[PDB]
Amino acid sequence: HHHHMQIFVKTLTGKTITLEVESNDTIENVKSKIQDKEGIPPDQQRLIFAGKQLEDGRTLSDYNIQKESTLHLVLRLRGGMQIFVKTLTGKTITLEVESNDTIENVKSKIQDKEGIPPDQQRLIFAGKQLEDGRTLSDYNIQKESTLHLVLRLR
C-alpha cells in the first residue's frame, strides 16, 4: 500500500533538503517539488540512487526508496545529448550519450542501468537493427531520438 514518507535530496554544494512525498510519487513529481523549493528547472535535474539515474515516469517505490533515504541531485547544463530507449512493454530508459557512441557501448549503458545483458538486447531505430561496431551517428540518431529495445527469453 502507498504511504507517506520524508526523503532527503542532497546537492553537491552541501545542502540537504527534506521533501514530503508519497511512496508512489513519480520521479517527475519529485523534480517538480525540487523546482518549487529550490527553483531548479526539472530538465536540468538528474536524481541518482543506488548509483543509477532515476527515470522520470517511474515511482519512488519502483526504486525501493524508503523513509529518510537520500537522493543525490546532480545538475546538468541544458542540452546534453540524451536518447530514449523504449521497450515494447512501455518501459523508458533514458541514456546520456555522445553522438559517436558505439552501439555496444549503448547496450553496456543499458546493462548498467537496467541489468539486461547486452547479448539479450536488440536495438531498433527507423526499422533497422543497430549493429555492434557502428555508432549512433551512423544511424542519424541524435538528441532526443527514441529507439526500440526488443528482448527474447534467455
Helices vs. strands in the chain: H and E counts, helices first: 2, 10
Cell numbers for 146: 527514441
Three-state DSSP state, 154: coil
Q: How is the chain split among helix, strand and coil, in percent rounded to 5?
A: 25, 35, 40
Domain identity same for 54 and 102 = no
Question: Where does residue 134 fall: left (phi above 0), alpha (psi -120 to 50 degrees), or beta otherwise?
Answer: beta
- 11 with 66, same domain? yes
Host domain of residue 21:
1-78
The Cβ of residue 95 has, within 10 Å, a number of other Cβ atoms equal to 19
Structure-solving method: X-ray
Nine-digit cell string for 150: 526488443
Q: How many domains does the chain have?
A: 2
Q: What is the DSSP string of 3-30?
A: -EEEEEEEETTS-EEEEEEETT-BHHHH
Residues in the chain, total = 154
137 shares a domain with 120: yes
Gap between the Cα atoms of 137 and 108, Å rounded? 17
**Cell numbers representing residue 118 in the block:** 547486452
Asked if residue 87 and residue 74 are part of one domain, the reply reads no
Question: 147 and 86 in one domain?
Answer: yes
Residues 83 and 65 in one domain: no
Q: Tell me which of 78, 111, 141 is where a domain ends.
A: 78
Same domain? For 50 and 107 the reply is no
Residues 7 and 34 in one domain: yes
Q: Are residues 72 and 101 in the same domain?
A: no
Domain match, 58 and 99 both: no
Strands in 52-53's sheet, in edge-to-edge order, are 16-22, 4-11, 70-75, 45-49, 52-53
